[PDB]
Amino acid sequence: ARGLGTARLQLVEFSAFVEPPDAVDSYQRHLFVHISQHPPLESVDVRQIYDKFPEKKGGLRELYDRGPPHAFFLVKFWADLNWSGGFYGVSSQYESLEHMTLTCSSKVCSFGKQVVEKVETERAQLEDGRFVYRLLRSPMCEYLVNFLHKLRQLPERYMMNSVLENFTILQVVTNRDTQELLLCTAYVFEVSTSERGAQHHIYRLVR
Numbered sequence: 225a226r227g228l229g230t231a232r233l234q235l236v237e238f239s240a241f242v243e244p245p246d247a248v249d250s251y252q253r254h255l256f257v258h259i260s261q262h263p264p265l266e267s268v269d270v271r272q273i274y275d276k277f278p279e280k281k282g283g284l285r286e287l288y289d290r291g292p293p294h295a296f297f298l299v300k301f302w303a304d305l306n307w308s309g310g311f312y313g314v315s316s317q318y319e320s321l322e323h324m325t326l327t328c329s330s331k332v333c334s335f336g337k338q339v340v341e342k343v344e345t346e347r348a349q350l351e352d353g354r355f356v357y358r359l360l361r362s363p364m365c366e367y368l369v370n371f372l373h374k375l376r377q378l379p380e381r382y383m384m385n386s387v388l389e390n391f392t393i394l395q396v397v398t399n400r401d402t403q404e405l406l407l408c409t410a411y412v413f414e415v416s417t418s419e420r421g422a423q424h425h426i427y428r429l430v431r
């Protein structure tokens with residue numbers, strides 16, 4: 225595996241951003257986290273991150289045990305929390321060669337317990353032979369907008385970091401007609417010293 229994706233489904237872009245109210249005068253958006261996929265990756269053993277996500281019934285080890293292991297990835301984000309009352313959004317684009325309908329479940333876990341879940345469905349859209357699946361500008365759920373504001377306030381980066389130590393997200397992309405899991409992505413978090421912007425690192429999850 226050489227990127228965040230498998231032979232059926234590839235992630236083209238993902239980001240979480242905020243556009244300030246000024247955006248409609250002169251445009252700007254701040255990116256908290258951004259993957260852009262316009263040697264093989266490193267491994268991380270899935271057993272390491274079991275206790276960071278729910279247990280079974282929608283949890284990592286029940287999923288990884290139903291395979292396929294090449295579908296599972298870990299993304300460590302370094303979030304840029306340096307940027308009230310604007311638009312907070314999330315944007316996902318995937319690409320395949322097969323025509324499919326997709327269900328994208330994203331579960332937000334605090335201390336390894338689902339706190340908020342969103343489930344969307346995106347039908348494929350033919351383009352240059354490939355199919356594009358576009359879930360652009362989904363409004364960020366108000367738990368995360370609140371959470372981010374709270375995190376912005378903490379007095380020290382190392383406190384944000386230990387708070388974020390217990391904050392993970394699990395995205396599960398499944399073929400809605402088949403139920404075949406196509407992509408599973410666990411997200412762990414730290415903050416970035418915002419001269420450096422958002423950064424990230426993508427691993428394969430193995431055993």
Ligand SMILES: OCCc1c[nH]c2ccc(OCc3ccccc3)cc12
Nearest residue numbers: 240256303314330342364365393413
């Ligand atoms: O409404 C669902 C939103 C969503 C699904 N999957 C995601 C993956 C990342 C992410 O960024 C938020 C974040 C940035 C910095 C620190 C903590 C959280 C948001 C989402």
